[PDB]
């Protein structure tokens, strides 16, 4: 599995409420989080697809 996989999920910074995903390494699901626009890390997808497709 990627590395980035295993990055906690990030808020980054910005001002935004994005509804993002983010691979949940301790149960195996992509899971919705909220992005605030700017910066956070690669465990960090616009869609449910794209992280299942990379981290299952």
């Keep these: ?3 980035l996989c ?3 999920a ?5 001002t935004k409420s994005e ?4 691979y949940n ?3 195996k699901q992509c899971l919705r ?3 605030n626009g700017k910066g956070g890390n ?3 997808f616009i869609h449910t ?6 981290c299952l």
């Design 1 to 3: 599995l990627p590395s």
């Design 6 to 8: 295993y990055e906690p």
């Design 10 to 14: 990030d808020s980054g910074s910005g």
């Design 19 to 22: 509804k993002r995903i983010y």
């Design 25 to 27: 390494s301790a149960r």
């Design 33 to 35: 989080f909220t992005y």
């Design 42 to 44: 690669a465990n960090n």
């Design 49 to 54: 697809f794209d992280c299942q497709h990379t």
